[PDB]
């Protein structure tokens with residue numbers, strides 16, 4: 246099926262998912278000199294104090310940290326958003342080398358990785374209905390650069406050896422996603438899509454300006470994960486990022 250290689254990677258996705266060539270695809274390059282400050286944006290509210298993580302899953306393309314989204318516990322509101330969006334999962338995209346890995350770019354600059362906190366609009370009742378709506382999802386994107394370790398990431402790094410291969414999961418309760426956030430919530434926002442098949446055009450993207458730093462040893466552990474299943478030959482899970490797609494006359498707004 247779809248993947249990140251020569252034969253099944255982003256250049257091929259349009260065949261099973263024609264929307265890959267659509268009008269609001271993600272990621273995009275953020276041209277900081279074209280983005281305009283928007284005084285009408287309300288402040289962003291990231292409310293993760295009551296977040297309830299359940300499980301971490303290697304899905305053969307990345308790893309998902311899943312949350313209990315059956316009540317308002319971990320929510321995003323404000324900024325460009327109307328109403329309340331509940332956190333369902335987070336995951337990362339990363340490179341084989343520190344010079345690449347993010348999906349969004351900033352004036353063409355690629356970061357070592359990018360974190361996506363995925364949230365659905367509680368007016369649509371659940372995730373599956375939300376992804377049929379142009380305002381169904383809100384993704385909080387955070388860049389990772391290699392430098393100092395991120396302490397709040399280490400519980401994730403240390404569980405990775407237990408989910409090396411496709412289909413493996415592990416209990417992952419009491420993980421606090423507040424430990425993954427940079428200091429500043431300054432952000433760019435634009436309308437876009439999920440960045441993996443089925444590439445649904447349902448996302449208000451909120452991309453924070455300030456990257457988090459993670460250590461070389463932390464990202465190296467991401468690169469030890471496998472795309473393949475247990476029992477299959479080793480295919481390191483690296484370079485699971487889609488490159489920048491055409492902006493097509495969308496406007497990126499700045500909160501700052």
Ligand SMILES: N[C@@H](Cc1c[nH]c2ccccc12)C(=O)O
Nearest residue numbers: 311333334370371372373374375
């Ligand atoms: N089952 C998916 C998400 C999903 C697919 N269809 C849905 C319908 C309703 C709610 C959620 C879903 C998951 O969490 O892996």
Ligand SMILES: [Zn+2]
Nearest residue numbers: 337338361440
């Ligand atoms: Zn993603």
